[PDB]
Structures are given as structure tokens and as C-alpha cells.
Design a protein around this ligand. Structure first.
Ligand code: HEM
Ligand code: HEM
Ligand code: HEM
Ligand code: HEM
Ligand code: HEM
Ligand code: HEM
Ligand code: HEM
Ligand code: HEM
Ligand code: HEM
Ligand code: HEM
Ligand SMILES: O=N[O-]
Ligand SMILES: O=N[O-]
Ligand SMILES: [Ca+2]
Ligand SMILES: [Ca+2]
Ligand SMILES: [Y+2]
Ligand SMILES: [Y+2]
Ligand SMILES: [Y+2]
Ligand SMILES: [Y+2]
Ligand SMILES: [Y+2]
Lengths: 471, 471
């Protein structure tokens, strides 16, 4: 039993845990070190055309340290510029995987209430970034999943729940609270006061299993679309970082190596063993992350991962080129008068092409976690795109445009023009929000004692649209 | 030093080595056990359309035991039905990787003479199957490459020659004498008597390196084609079992695991160590072949290889479907009057698509030896085929056939009809050859003492076109 066996007052604030676990606190805080913003839309402008009509066409960056999760959620152009608790583009579900205040609020107000209303609803309550309370019981300190949708998904897929799982399974599952593909299920409900309400509930599409194809079949069955494509009017599916799903099928996952084995390796000091809580790039700490199981140089092992990255990039660029062209050729056919009936099969191929390719690349570590499935998915997605494109030639020909050449989209600027994204307007609106309502949120939270100003040091020095210089 | 330090009389006949090395002789002879004929044209009829205009569209089977190499070379419809030493479709180079009589003849008559003339030229001389003399010096018993084209290729690619290589390298290189991609270089020469002659010389296309793309660039540079496609009139490249080339880049090859480590594992008996010379499927002997380096069940490891096979099959079937369609659509465009100039880019895409896909699948173990490169190649080949097909729609449209549907080729029979292969005629001709000239070859060789009848036991009980019942 622990030194805090009756629980921790202020448990959502990781600083409250520091008196018991100074070592783990220190290393946890060190994800502050991973502060680079890589604008993925700049790196891969094809992604802009893929996500036209959807917020990811505005702003999409690579992950950085857990230290920045909450602030990046606030900064991203995707969450827009609320003026109050009732405005802004996105729902409350956007906080879910960003903060230990989330289980705090679910515990206080119930899952359905939590999932009701705008993202802006909780701006002055959900103020701590990914912390001890997202993974640890505040009495026993044992690993716990704090979000009900994980077990719900695990059960739906015929897996053991978190509590029924082994300790080694739990050492990946704590990560799977967030590092999985999800959608928002519109959920009608009535509260205690009998008021009718609508929740947007985080749901793992795992009821047919966890492969890309089973999830595709799941979504097709319920006729679900995340958005209607801004160019092709295809009913589109967005993949989000299926990190755990793809990991599960790769060789490491099959051999029972946990996320924690590479991402949180042990240091042995006599009788005591500590987990590195600085969650980052395992290739930065190979001696600890890899070399207890592998037996040659760091440089050789790094070279082999680099080869995997290169293969993935090659197939990614092919697949997203054909997907982008397919979208543009479809929009052209629409302009010439092609009907929904003439385009139905094409749009299905596009939906599936992009679902498979997005599932392949949306988990940034998947090229390594499950290298062969990643390559297969990109090949499968590209084949679907090409099937669409062959059919599109014939539709274009019917409408007198067989020689149409889809426009280029090789820069973020060109791509965003095609996708009709007015960035400068979005940025201007965002800055006003940050300068006004965001600062009010932080002020109120500090006054209430929900937020410790110490946690904000260097947290807001970068986004895709500013760099004050270092975080 | 050995018990045969002055060399072995009758060295080409492996039975001559048995007095010194009874153990290795016994296990070597046991490849007799691997006698199954799997007709690959029946399994994958798309291959027939791919190889239309070429002998592989007639007969193409999976490998079986080394015990059958020479006889399968005789049996295959590819070598046809010579009536004498001057007839038949194929050249002397077809013996090269089938027999220890090959280095015997090269040593006696010179490389260029050996490579001059028809396959039928050596029917009564090249009569022993893959034996001790293909890999071992008959004085020292050390590993040796017995064919000059291997070092020539190794040097061309900037590798060490056989003699300059390590013992562990030699333990793969002996296999690479045969288990590599090659072509025949037409070579003009003058003999001792000053007669002008033409050799067809086995050549490894390795001067730009050993990747599929470097070899593609090699072949393109010299404008080489193995054949002109029977349907599409594309200048085609045939891949042959690039087993060593693809192995070299896979993780096992990168980690320095030799072919011999899996395919010829050691048994330790006290002070003595013996190599299993029964070269076969390592999955039949996992405890010896895998489990000195891997630490879980045989069933789990077998399951993981099976998954790799499944991924490869998936991408193979896609790629060869589009390649086959591309060939057929090209033939259709030709029928309608499309010109060589209109088809030039299309034909280039087809050539490259098939080169990449054939290189991926022609080494039957490559899905395992280099799983990720195999998937990448199939994806790359398919993309080239689809590029061709998009351009083909437009050519077809110009000629009034936009809605043309390439015919199906889902059975060997249907496929061979499209490829215009009269099997029953080829088989009838072959049987006459076997019943007449082949039996004369074996008779003469036995009379001369080049062939021991004991080696023929059960050697000729199966082909793709007969099964007397068991080999
Ligand atoms: C031990 C289990 C976990 C592992 C192995 C893991 C892995 C990672 C890695 C490697 C990164 C990128 C780090 C960097 O670039 O420096 C990251 C970022 C991120 N993780 Fe996790 N994670 C885990 C737990 C969680 C949990 C429980 C959540 C949700 C509460 C979460 C949500 C996020 C978010 C939102 C980001 C992006 C942060 C940003 O860009 O601001 N992770 N994670
Ligand atoms: C639509 C509502 C959400 C918004 C606006 C949002 C925002 C963000 C942002 C801004 C990032 C940093 C990278 C980037 O620029 O995209 C991020 C990363 C991440 N988010 Fe979300 N989030 C949402 C919903 C969720 C949910 C419900 C989960 C968990 C079930 C989640 C888990 C993660 C994880 C694991 C990462 C790091 C891995 C990666 O980005 O590839 N997010 N999110
Ligand atoms: C500063 C806040 C945190 C504190 C004080 C804390 C505390 C601890 C303690 C006392 C242990 C056991 C000793 C050790 O292995 O080092 C541990 C391990 C662990 N924690 Fe945390 N933790 C924090 C944050 C997190 C978060 C956010 C996650 C989830 C993403 C997490 C996941 C894990 C995992 C997977 C282990 C290893 C468990 C095992 O190997 O049995 N921790 N932590
Ligand atoms: C980030 C650090 C690591 C790196 C860079 C790495 C690298 C690799 C690579 C390249 C493979 C070949 C499979 C593939 O094609 O990807 C592999 C497989 C494997 N690794 Fe790791 N690995 C790491 C961590 C670990 C750890 C921590 C363990 C032990 C818990 C482990 C045990 C295994 C096992 C059992 C396999 C299956 C193949 C075999 O049985 O050897 N690895 N790894
Ligand atoms: C489901 C469990 C796991 C999760 C949630 C997870 C999380 C992640 C994430 C989010 C990334 C992308 C990092 C970024 O883009 O900044 C990543 C990359 C990576 N992960 Fe994991 N990981 C898991 C399991 C593993 C395992 C078991 C290993 C080692 C065998 C491993 C080693 C790596 C490596 C080597 C990279 C790539 C680093 C680079 O290319 O720079 N991960 N992981
Ligand atoms: C130790 C090095 C070698 C390895 C690992 C190896 C591997 C193999 C394997 C696994 C098979 C299929 C066996 C079966 O299905 O039962 C095979 C067949 C074959 N090998 Fe090798 N081999 C080696 C050396 C050679 C050499 C030196 C040559 C040329 C002289 C050669 C030529 C052939 C041929 C022609 C076949 C097909 C035989 C038939 O179908 O009748 N191999 N080899
Ligand atoms: C065009 C002349 C040749 C002919 C007619 C021929 C014939 C054959 C036959 C009938 C087989 C059994 C499998 C099948 O049915 O295809 C085979 C397999 C094989 N041959 Fe040849 N061969 C020729 C040239 C060569 C050369 C020059 C080499 C070595 C450089 C070679 C190496 C092999 C190997 C390694 C196999 C087993 C691997 C596999 O088939 O995938 N062959 N050959
Ligand atoms: C019946 C005919 C053969 C005889 C009598 C013979 C003899 C021997 C002997 C005495 C050894 C050393 C002891 C041992 O490791 O078992 C050996 C090993 C070996 N042989 Fe053979 N051999 C024959 C056929 C072949 C063939 C056709 C090949 C090539 C495809 C070959 C390749 C090898 C290899 C790779 C080794 C292991 C060398 C090492 O690990 O150092 N052998 N053989
Ligand atoms: C036919 C028997 C074998 C099987 C079925 C097998 C299976 C595997 C698999 C599935 C992998 C993961 C790489 C991949 O994605 O393919 C791997 C890698 C690896 N294997 Fe094997 N293997 C065999 C033989 C061997 C042998 C004989 C050795 C030792 C000489 C060895 C040492 C390694 C090494 C060093 C790796 C790289 C990953 C690591 O460092 O663990 N393997 N093997
Ligand atoms: C260049 C060196 C090698 C050569 C020439 C070679 C030869 C071959 C050939 C010709 C096949 C196809 C067999 C058939 O279709 O009947 C094959 C398959 C196979 N080889 Fe190799 N091999 C080499 C290296 C290795 C290594 C290093 C390993 C283990 C790490 C290995 C393990 C296997 C396995 C597991 C199969 C598949 C058996 C099956 O799927 O049924 N080979 N090999
Ligand atoms: O954008 N959060 O997956
Ligand atoms: O057909 N011998 O590669
Ligand atoms: Ca989704
Ligand atoms: Ca060739
Ligand atoms: Y406290
Ligand atoms: Y990152
Ligand atoms: Y792999
Ligand atoms: Y003798
Ligand atoms: Y076989």
C-alpha cells in the first residue's frame, strides 16, 4: 500500500503527485523537451487535397511531447475561435485525450454530460495536460484506464477488459486510452432534470475487429461519414492515429512487447526499478529501449528503421498522389454535369482508398510498429484510387474532357487554394480568441486553483502559425 | 588435409564422394523426398498472360528437390523436343545450374565453347544432377564457386569475389552460383582453329548493383529484351529466382545469417559437426533451422510466416491482374490500329510493371527472405501497370472502344488460349523426344561411364503433364 492510500487532494494536477513520486514526476515533466512543430500539411500537401472540406485541411502537425497536448489542442486551427462556451466549430469530445481533468469531469458530471456541448464549454476546467491521473489510481497507484470507451471497444472486439488483462497488456492499454482510431457517435439522452440532450460520444469502431478492413466494414454498415469531401463530395472516413490497433498485429505486438517496453524503459538501481516517464522517440535512448533484446550496434538498428521509413514514404507519396488526382477528377466531372449515380462507384473506391491509406499513415510510428501491414495498406489504398481513376477517365470522356489534367498540389499554398481554405482569415480569428477568451480561461482556472501557472512555462511558444522562438 | 588430397577420379559423379563423406552423401540424396510437382501456371494463370510469347507460358512449376534438377530441365516443355544435337528451342546455357557435369565440361572445353550451341549439344554428357562437385573442391573439400559468371557479377557490383569473401559469405555464395537472376549475352568469339562462333553466355545484370531498380536501369541502358510480348508486343524482361539478390537486403541477410544457416543447419555429435545436406523447406525442421536464434513455439513462428505469404499473395494477385489486363488492352488497341508511337509510353510502363512484379515473386522464398521489399516491389509494379491502364483507356477511346472489357484469364486453359499456346501439340512432341532421343542420351552416358543408373531411381515419375504416381 502507498503513502496516499486514502487518495490525493487535487489529484488531476500532476504536481500533487510529486511529493510521493519525485523521480517519475521529474521524467514525466521532461517531455517539455520535445517541442518541435512539424507542419504535416507543409511536408505532405497532398494531405490538404485529401482532407478538403474537413478541419485537418487547415492545420495538422506531427505529435510532440505530452507536455504540449492541452496547449496544442487549444492552438490548433481545427478548434477555431469560440467567443464563449456555446460557440466554436468542435464539440467537448476534443478534450478527451488531452488532460487528467477529463476523468475528473466525467467522474463529477457523468460521461453523457461531459460529451454534451461545445469544446469551449470546458475551457476553464480542462486545463492540465496529460498527467499521472490519466494512467494511475490515486489510492493504489496501479495502472488504470480512466475512460469508459476503451473497455467498451475492447469488449466489442472480443478482447479482455482492462481489469481482466495481464500486467503486460495493461502496459500498452493505458496508452490505448488515447492512441487509437475513434469517431463521434451522436447520442440522444435525457438528464436528471428530464431535459433532452445530444451527446457526441467518443467511440472505437472495433465491433467487427481491429483490422483496417473490419473497421471499414463497420463504418460502411452504419453508412457513416466523418465529412462530405469538399472537392469530390465523397462520403469520407478520417483515420486518427490507430497506434495500438496497428501495433497489435506487428511482430513486436504479437511477441507481447508492450508500448512501455520501448517508450518507457526501465532503469535498475539496486533493488529499485524505475520507468522512464519521458515518453518520446525510443531511437533517442536505444541502449535502454532496444538493446536488452537486440544484439548489434545502434547505428545498424537505426539504419534498418530508416529503410522502413523510406519504403513507407515511397508508397505513401504514390497513394496520396492518386487519391488527390481522383478527388480533383471527380470535382471536374461534377462541374461538367456528371450525376451522383454516374459517380457512385467512383466515390466508393475513393472512400476506401483514402480510409486504407490514412489508416496506414495516421499512426506515425506504424511504419515501424507494423511495417508489413503498413506497406500492404498503402498498396491496397492506391489500388482502390487507381480503380476510381480508370472509371473517371470514362466519365470525363462522356462529358468531353478525356484529356483533362488534374491541377498540381505540390505546395501547401497551392493545395489549400484547391481546397478553398482561407488560412489568413482562420489565423486572424484564432489569434483574437487566444488573446481574449483563452487568457480568460487560464486566469479563471488559476483563480479557482484548477491550474498551476508553473505548468505553463514555455508551453505556448510555438504553433504551425507562430514561433516566438523556443518552447 | 583430406583422404582425397590428389583429387577424385569421376569427381562429377557425386557417388564417387560417398567413400569419404557417407553422412553428407546420405542427406544430399534425401532431396529425392521433395518430389511434388506444383504447376504454377495452373495455380496462377495470370502468369500465362504475363509470359505470352515466351516458353514460361508453356510450362512453369514450383521448385522441388535438387535430386530432380537435371530431369526437370529435360522434362520441362520449355526445352522442347530436339531431334539431334543441333535442334530444339533453347541453348546450351540451360544446363548451367542443373549439374556438376557443367564445371567438368567448362574445365575441359572452355567457357565460350560450353556456351556455344543448342541445349541438345550436351544431352549425353550433362547427366548428373546438382552434386558435391558444384560446391566443393575435389582435393581440399573447401567451398568453391565453380562458375566464372558469379565472380564476374560480384565484381561488377563492387562485392568481394568468392575467394576474397568470408567463410560465412561463402556459405551463401555457393547457392548464388544458381539462385540469382540472369540473362544470356550474345557473345561473338573465335576458337583455336580460328572458326567464328556465337556463344549465349550466362550473365548476372549486376553492374549497377543488385536492387530490382538498378537491374531495371541496367537492362534499359543496353535496350535488352528477353522477348517481344505475344499479345502487347512490349519489349519484356523475365525475372528468374533472384533468391540471393533479394535475400541480401532482407533483415536476415543484413544480420549475416547465411542461406546455409536455415537451409543446411548443423547437428553436433560430440566433437564433430555435420551440415544437413537435405536442402528443402526450413519450416520442416524448425528446431534446427530457426530455434537456435528464436525463442518461442514452432506453431507461432510458422503462423507469422504464413501471414507474410498471405500479404504477398494479396498484392501478387492485384499486380498480375492489372498487368494481364494491360497486355490484353494493348493487344486490343493494336487490333484497332493504334501505332507503335501511340503505345510507346504504355509499353514502357508494362515492361517496368512486370519486371518489378516478376522480380518480387520469381524467388519463391523472397516473401520470407525480404518480406518488406517484396511488398514494395509488388506495389511499385502494380502502380506502373495502372499508369499504363489509365493511358490505355484514352488510346482505346481514340479508336472507338472505350468500353472494351479485357477477356478473363482465371484458368490455365483460358489463359493459354489467349496466349495461343497449343499445349497438346507441345506435349505430344515432347513425349516422342523423351521416348527416343532422351533414352539414347541416357543409354550412351551409362555406356560411357558418365552416368550411374542408380541415380535415376524414381527421377522420372512426374512432370506437369504426367504422373506415373510417385517419385
Ligand atoms: C505509455 C503510453 C503512451 C505512449 C507510449 C505514448 C506515445 C506517444 C508518443 C511517442 C508521442 C510523441 C512524443 C514526442 O513527439 O515527443 C505522444 C504524443 C501524444 N500523446 Fe501519447 N502515449 C501514451 C499515452 C498517452 C495517453 C494516455 C494519452 C491521452 C490522455 C496520450 C495522448 C497523446 C497526445 C494528445 C500527443 C500529442 C501531444 C502534442 O502534440 O501536443 N498519450 N504519445
Ligand atoms: C476532434 C477533436 C480533437 C481535436 C481538435 C484534437 C486535437 C489534436 C491536436 C491539435 C493534436 C496534435 C497534432 C496535430 O496537430 O494534429 C492531437 C494529437 C493527438 N490526439 Fe487529438 N484531438 C481531438 C480528439 C482526440 C481524441 C478523442 C483522442 C483519443 C481517443 C485523441 C488523441 C490524440 C493522440 C493520441 C495524438 C498524438 C498522435 C498523433 O497525432 O498522431 N484526439 N490532437
Ligand atoms: C508525474 C505523473 C506520474 C507519476 C507520479 C507516476 C508514477 C508512477 C509510479 C510510482 C510507477 C511505478 C514505478 C516505476 O515503474 O517507475 C509508474 C510506472 C508506470 N507508469 Fe506512471 N506516473 C505518472 C505518469 C504516467 C502516465 C501519464 C502514464 C500513461 C501514459 C503512466 C504509465 C505508467 C506505466 C506504463 C508504468 C510502468 C508500470 C509497470 O511496468 O508495471 N504514468 N508510474
Ligand atoms: C525501439 C527499439 C527496438 C528496435 C529499433 C527494434 C528493432 C527490431 C526489428 C528491426 C525487428 C525485425 C522485425 C521487423 O521487420 O520490424 C524486431 C523484431 C523483434 N524484436 Fe525488436 N526492436 C526494438 C525493441 C525490442 C524490445 C524492447 C524487445 C523485447 C521486449 C524486442 C524483441 C523483439 C522480438 C521478439 C522480435 C521478433 C523477431 C525475433 O524473434 O527476433 N524488440 N525488432
Ligand atoms: C500501442 C503501443 C505503442 C504506442 C501507443 C506507441 C506510440 C508511438 C507513437 C505515437 C509514435 C510516433 C512518434 C512521433 O511521430 O513523434 C511512435 C513511434 C515509434 N515507436 Fe512506438 N508505440 C507503441 C509501441 C512501440 C513498441 C512496442 C516499440 C518497440 C518495439 C516502439 C518503438 C517506436 C519506434 C522505434 C518509433 C519511431 C521513432 C522514429 O522513427 O523517429 N513503439 N510510437
Ligand atoms: C546451399 C545452397 C543452396 C540453397 C540454400 C538452395 C535452395 C534450394 C531450395 C530450398 C530448393 C527447393 C527445394 C525443394 O522444393 O525441396 C532448391 C531447388 C533448386 N535449386 Fe537450389 N539451393 C542451393 C544450391 C544450388 C545450386 C549450387 C544450384 C545449381 C547448381 C541450385 C539449383 C537449383 C535448381 C535447378 C532447383 C530446382 C530443382 C527442381 O525443381 O528440379 N541450387 N534450391
Ligand atoms: C533457359 C534455360 C533454362 C531452362 C530451360 C531451365 C529449366 C528449369 C526448370 C524446368 C526448373 C524447375 C522449375 C520450373 O518448372 O521452372 C528450373 C528451376 C531453377 N533453375 Fe533453371 N533453367 C534454365 C536456366 C537456368 C540458369 C542459367 C540458372 C542459374 C544461373 C538456373 C537456375 C535455376 C534455379 C536456381 C531453379 C530453382 C528456383 C526456382 O525455380 O524458382 N536456371 N530451371
Ligand atoms: C554428396 C555430395 C556432397 C558431399 C560429399 C559434401 C561434403 C561436405 C563436407 C565434408 C562438409 C563439411 C562437414 C559438414 O559441415 O557437414 C560439407 C559442408 C557444406 N557443404 Fe557439402 N557436400 C556435398 C554437396 C554439397 C552441395 C551440392 C552444396 C551446395 C549447394 C554444398 C554446400 C555445403 C555447405 C554450404 C557446407 C557447410 C560449410 C560450413 O559450414 O563451413 N555441399 N559438405
Ligand atoms: C527458417 C527459420 C527462421 C524463421 C522462421 C525466422 C523468423 C524470423 C522473423 C519472422 C523475423 C522478423 C523479421 C521479419 O519481419 O521477417 C526474424 C528476424 C531475425 N532473425 Fe530469424 N528466423 C529464422 C532463422 C534465423 C536464424 C537461423 C538466425 C540466426 C543465425 C536468426 C536470427 C534473426 C535475427 C538476428 C533477426 C533480426 C531481428 C532481431 O534482431 O531479432 N533467424 N526471423
Ligand atoms: C541466398 C540465400 C538463400 C537461398 C538461395 C534460399 C533459397 C530458398 C528457395 C529457393 C526457397 C523457395 C523454396 C520453394 O519454393 O520450394 C526458399 C524458401 C524459404 N527459405 Fe530460403 N534461401 C536463402 C536464405 C534463407 C535464410 C537465411 C533463411 C532463414 C532466415 C531461409 C528460410 C527460408 C524459409 C522459411 C522459406 C519458406 C518455406 C515455406 O514458405 O514453405 N532462407 N529459400
Ligand atoms: O486530433 N486528435 O486525434
Ligand atoms: O528456368 N531456370 O531459371
Ligand atoms: Ca476516425
Ligand atoms: Ca532474367
Ligand atoms: Y498535496
Ligand atoms: Y514527433
Ligand atoms: Y517485418
Ligand atoms: Y572412386
Ligand atoms: Y517447392
Amino acid at each position: 500500500k502507498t503513502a496516499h492510500s486514502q487518495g490525493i487532494e487535487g489529484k488531476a494536477m500532476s504536481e500533487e503527485w510529486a511529493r510521493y513520486y519525485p523521480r517519475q514526476f521529474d521524467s514525466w515533466k521532461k517531455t517539455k523537451e520535445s517541442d518541435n512543430i512539424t507542419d504535416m500539411l507543409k511536408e505532405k500537401p497532398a494531405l490538404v487535397v485529401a482532407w478538403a472540406g474537413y478541419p485537418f485541411s487547415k492545420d495538422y502537425n506531427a505529435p510532440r511531447g505530452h507536455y504540449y497536448a492541452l496547449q496544442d489542442n487549444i492552438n490548433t486551427l481545427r478548434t477555431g475561435a469560440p467567443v464563449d462556451g456555446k460557440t466554436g466549430p468542435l464539440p467537448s469530445a476534443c478534450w478527451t485525450c488531452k488532460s487528467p481533468d477529463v476523468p475528473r469531469i466525467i467522474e463529477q458530471d457523468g460521461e453523457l454530460e461531459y460529451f454534451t456541448g461545445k469544446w469551449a464549454k470546458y475551457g476553464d476546467e480542462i486545463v492540465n495536460t496529460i498527467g499521472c491521473y490519466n494512467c494511475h489510481d490515486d489510492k493504489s497507484a496501479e495502472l488504470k484506464s480512466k475512460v469508459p470507451y476503451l473497455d467498451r471497444g475492447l469488449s466489442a472486439a472480443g478482447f479482455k477488459t482492462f481489469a481482466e488483462s495481464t500486467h503486460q497488456e495493461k502496459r500498452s492499454l493505458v496508452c490505448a486510452q488515447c492512441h487509437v482510431e475513434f469517431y463521434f457517435k451522436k447520442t440522444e439522452w435525457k438528464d436528471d432534470k428530464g431535459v433532452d440532450k445530444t451527446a457526441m460520444v467518443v467511440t472505437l469502431p472495433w465491433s467487427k475487429g481491429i483490422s483496417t478492413e473490419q473497421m471499414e466494414a463497420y463504418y460502411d454498415e452504419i453508412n457513416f461519414a466523418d465529412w462530405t469531401h469538399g472537392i469530390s463530395k465523397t462520403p469520407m472516413l478520417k483515420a486518427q492515429h490507430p497506434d495500438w490497433e496497428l501495433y497489435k498485429t506487428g511482430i513486436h505486438g504479437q511477441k507481447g512487447v508492450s508500448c512501455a517496453d520501448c517508450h518507457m524503459p526501465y532503469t535498475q538501481e539496486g533493488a529499485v526499478k524505475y520507468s522512464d516517464h519521458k515518453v518520446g522517440n525510443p531511437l533517442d535512448n536505444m541502449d535502454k529501449s532496444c538493446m536488452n533484446c537486440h544484439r548489434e550496434s545502434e547505428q545498424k538498428l537505426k539504419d534498418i528503421v530508416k529503410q522502413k521509413f523510406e519504403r513507407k514514404e515511397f508508397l505513401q507519396d504514390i497513394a496520396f498522389d492518386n487519391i488527390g488526382k481522383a478527388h480533383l477528377e471527380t470535382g471536374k466531372a461534377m462541374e461538367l454535369g456528371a450525376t451522383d449515380a454516374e459517380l457512385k462507384e467512383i466515390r466508393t473506391h475513393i472512400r476506401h482508398a483514402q480510409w486504407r491509406a490514412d489508416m496506414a499513415i495516421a499512426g506515425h510510428g506504424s511504419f515501424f510498429h507494423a511495417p508489413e501491414e503498413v506497406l500492404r495498406l498503402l498498396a491496397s489504398g492506391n489500388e482502390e484510387a487507381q480503380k476510381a481513376r480508370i472509371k473517371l477517365v470514362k466519365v470525363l470522356a462522356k462529358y468531353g474532357a478525356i484529356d483533362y489534367v488534374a491541377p498540381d498540389f505540390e505546395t501547401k499554398e497551392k493545395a489549400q487554394k484547391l481546397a478553398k481554405v482561407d488560412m489568413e482569415a482562420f489565423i486572424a480569428e484564432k489569434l483574437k480568441f487566444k488573446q481574449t477568451l483563452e487568457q480568460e480561461w487560464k486566469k479563471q482556472a488559476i483563480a479557482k486553483g484548477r491550474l498551476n501557472p508553473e505548468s505553463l512555462k514555455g508551453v505556448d511558444e510555438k504553433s504551425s502559425y507562430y514561433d516566438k522562438t523556443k518552447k
